UniProtKB/TrEMBL annotation:
It comes from Acinetobacter baumannii (strain ATCC 19606 / DSM 30007 / JCM 6841 / CCUG 19606 / CIP 70.34 / NBRC 109757 / NCIMB 12457 / NCTC 12156 / 81). Cytidine binds at residues 70, 116. Belongs to the PTH family. InterPro entries: Pept_tRNA_hydro, Pept_tRNA_hydro_CS, Pept_tRNA_hydro_sf. The keyword S-adenosyl-L-methionine does not apply. This is Peptidyl-tRNA hydrolase. The lineage of its organism: Bacteria, Pseudomonadati, Pseudomonadota, Gammaproteobacteria, Moraxellales.
Length: 193
């Protein structure tokens, strides 16, 4: 198994989106960046904010597309292509409507599952990258999906998601060191408090 060398977090730009569920992927990556002291800088060339540094003895790049969510591939695709990073060395963190807050899963391969950021990336790099699916809950009806993902979660749900994000954070070491099956067991085993 490939070491993970590029971690992407999906979301929308601007302070009006910063706290919305749709930016779960940004939360995980911003928090990872600061855990390891990796600086995220504007990288207009690749339509995003990005950084690079040592995480647990491996050199990792971190990317947040600034394209808006549905256009995320306009940053992820040229960036991974420019640094010749294979999909199998990519982890993409993203909000997951199909799992509750406090649930988190590592998945390798498969399609976008309706996620409009992943929809914009699978076509161009293929599906064989890893995903950190951060459960955000489903509001109970298709009509309310949009106001849900584009909405700020209440405190209780936010704690659960943060709890799940902290757990995955503690597993990145396995991920960057190539132990994906171990990481998968250990991330996927998470249940809150």
């Amino acid at each position: 198994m490939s070491n993970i060398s590029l971690i992407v977090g999906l979301g929308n730009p601007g302070s009006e989106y910063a706290q919305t569920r749709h930016n779960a992927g940004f939360w995980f990556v911003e928090q990872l960046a600061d855990k390891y002291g990796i600086t995220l800088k504007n990288d207009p060339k690749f339509h995003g904010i990005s950084g690079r540094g040592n995480i647990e003895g491996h050199d990792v790049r971190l990317l947040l597309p600034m394209t808006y969510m549905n256009r995320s591939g306009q940053s992820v695709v040229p960036f991974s292509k420019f640094y010749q990073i294979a999909p199998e060395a990519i982890l993409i963190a993203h909000d997951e409507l199909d799992m509750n807050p406090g649930v988190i899963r590592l998945k390798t391969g498969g399609g976008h599952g309706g996620h409009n950021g992943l929809r914009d990336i699978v076509p161009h790099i293929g599906p064989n990258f890893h995903r950190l699916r951060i459960g955000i809950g489903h509001p109970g009806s298709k009509e309310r999906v949009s106001g849900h993902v584009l909405g700020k979660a209440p405190s209780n749900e936010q704690s659960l998601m943060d709890g799940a994000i902290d757990h995955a954070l503690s597993k990145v070491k396995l991920l960057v060191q190539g132990q994906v099956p171990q990481a998968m067991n250990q991330i996927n085993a998470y249940k809150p408090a």
